[PDB]
Amino acid sequence: EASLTGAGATFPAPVYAKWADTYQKETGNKVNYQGIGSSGGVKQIIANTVDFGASDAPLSDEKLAQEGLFQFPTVIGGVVLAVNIPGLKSGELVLDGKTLGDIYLGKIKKWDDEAIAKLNPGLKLPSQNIAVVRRATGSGTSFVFTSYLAKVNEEWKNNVGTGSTVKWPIGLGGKGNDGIAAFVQRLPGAIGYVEYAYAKQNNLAYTKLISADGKPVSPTEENFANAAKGADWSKTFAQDLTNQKGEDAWPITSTTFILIHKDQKKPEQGTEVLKFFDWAYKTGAKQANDLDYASLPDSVVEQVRAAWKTNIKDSSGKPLY
């Protein structure tokens, strides 16, 4: 029986927590996961204060080598826009990239604006003020969201850019994916970006979006998976899943990563960390789908196992997988 600690991204916390609970019920091993945001996860693993870190933003090959870290992907999720709009039911409103960016730039202030009406011919939109919400500190969800905005709105790209943190043009700060969810729920007229599970599990309304190919698409497990169908995983785990071509490709999709040290000074802990994740790939797919996270293809989990044998070892150089 092992006692393990992980910390980082809130984007996948719902599935890591469920995996952890089930794993304990079946093997007795205990995994404690702290959802503190991707930046804190990177800082904590580098500081050796946790057995494993978690970040939705991938570290470059050079940064990994500099810190003696190894990175591997777990699941595929999707970022959606949770909204609190009077009269409209969930999934009713459609936004495109350009207009979404204009809302986040503060150019569009009301829900019945001409640009939103044009995208929604049949809807009776309210004259409600839009209340924009965003993340309070360094966030992996913010990284994928701003990575998307920079591709579809040039003004955003040139003045604000992409990052785990950016100089937000407008918007109240919410802490964690759960904080943005709670803000949307209490604020009539609100719009906030969150990983899908955070909107669905809290019964929040969300919008549809226009794919890179120009078609309206709904956010679903299958549609997040579709956005990764063209990913050449064999080249690198650090795949960009925003604004991808293809039928029913959710435009704001992303995978997420686990970081661990290659030279394990507590080899028993590392050995157990790998067993937890392997068990998850082997048996946890139903738990991931129940939460609407798409599973990585078997080919990718095989890449991860092969890489574990080659990179994770004790101080004498013995492989831990």
Ligand SMILES: [Cl-]
């Ligand atoms: Cl936060």
